[PDB]
């Protein structure tokens, strides 16, 4: 269910595949939507820049409880460096969501290259993509909290 | 002066040109350096993903006082929406630093495409590029505070 937003499909598929395979977490998407100057607010995020004929961004923003559970699912309970691990894990998950979503977008006729991820930490920080276009956001729920996937291009 | 880091040159030139022309601010670079898992900490940042044969990131992270003065220099004292203005201004400055630096890097034989910027807000947030390569950082000073420019590719 994509609320009329066809580009949400590759993101939902990518997000579910990556979290299920890498972390054993089956995330539940909420309603996709588009909004000018949409802002995501959370505790740990990652941002990837995408380029091509059209240019933009992909980001994933997690609540702290959601990210902690993600990292535990990915690495196990044998984790000593929670800080660097949370960074590397969120970065890796975002990188694979970008990879699989862009594979799907390319099948839909939109070819994008992707950068490496930048991880943002800080409780209650905001991510604001600066673009002329509306920004797509899809909230997801897990048993341990929420995260939001965003995508835009111009 | 680049502390043996040749890629710092296009960033210093870009940073000084953009701040001088757009804001009337002449920023003073400190010592460029490279470090694995370097982290930038600040109050307002922007991140751009870069792509090509090599892939990575460009970011600029400002202290709050530095960003406020930047926005005043760019827009004047007739500014009512300081929040959206700070976002658009930091995004624009970062986009032009990316543009001019990449023009310089391409002259040095490294061709990168750049994404649109993502603005991060939150006092004391951190930016952690996730890459196998060391990350270049260059601190800059202005009369109203500090900001750090980062660049990496793999």
């Amino acid at each position: 269910s994509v609320n009329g937003i066809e580009v949400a499909k590759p993101f939902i598929a990518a997000t579910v595949n990556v979290l299920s395979t890498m972390a054993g977490i089956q995330p539940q998407p909420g309603k996709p939507y588009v909004k000018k100057n949409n802002v995501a607010k959370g505790d740990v995020s990652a941002v990837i820049g995408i380029t091509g004929h059209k240019n933009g961004s992909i980001s994933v923003t997690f609540t702290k409880s959601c990210a902690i559970a993600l990292v535990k699912g990915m690495l196990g309970d044998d984790i000593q460096d929670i800080l660097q691990d949370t960074k590397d894990a969120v970065g890796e998950v975002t990188n694979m969501i970008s990879g699989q979503a862009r594979a799907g977008l390319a099948e839909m006729g939109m070819v994008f290259q992707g950068s490496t991820p930048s991880v943002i930490m800080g409780d209650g920080h905001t991510i604001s993509h600066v673009t002329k276009s509306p920004i797509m956001a899809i909230p997801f729920l897990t048993n341990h909290g929420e995260f939001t996937v965003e995508f835009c291009f111009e």
Side-chain angles (χ1 to χ4, degrees), chain A residues 1-77 79 81-131 133-154:
Chain A
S1 71
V2 294
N3 191 29
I5 302 164
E6 282 298 297
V7 295
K9 294 183 182 169
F11 284 94
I12 291 166
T15 298
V16 172
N17 287 349
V18 169
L19 269 69
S20 305
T21 303
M22 301 198 178
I25 296 168
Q26 297 287 161
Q28 169 66 61
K31 190 169 75 188
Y33 68 95
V34 296
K35 181 175 155 68
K36 187 74 180 73
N37 299 334
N38 203 61
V39 177
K41 180 170 175 174
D43 307 312
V44 194
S45 298
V47 172
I48 287 174
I50 63 181
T51 65
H53 174 58
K54 298 292 172 75
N55 302 279
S57 308
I58 292 173
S59 60
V60 191
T61 297
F62 293 88
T63 67
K64 182 185 303 186
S65 59
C66 189
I68 290 166
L70 173 77
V71 174
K72 288 177 185 165
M74 290 176 70
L75 304 183
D77 289 45
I79 58 197
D81 191 344
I82 193 71
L83 181 54
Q84 191 65 51
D85 290 350
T86 299
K87 292 180 191 193
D88 294 343
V90 174
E92 287 166 18
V93 158
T94 304
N95 193 249
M96 296 307 315
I97 288 175
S98 167
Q100 290 202 354
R102 289 183 298 104
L105 289 164
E107 293 166 0
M108 291 170 69
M110 272 190 282
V111 180
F112 292 102
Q113 284 64 69
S115 76
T116 52
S118 306
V119 170
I120 297 96
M121 302 191 72
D123 291 353
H125 72 258
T126 60
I127 306 301
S128 301
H129 309 302
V130 174
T131 179
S133 298
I135 291 158
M136 182 208 77
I138 310 163
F140 290 81
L141 281 183
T142 70
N143 295 342
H144 298 274
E146 187 275 340
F147 67 94
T148 298
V149 175
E150 296 194 317
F151 168 58
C152 62
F153 62 84
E154 69 176 24

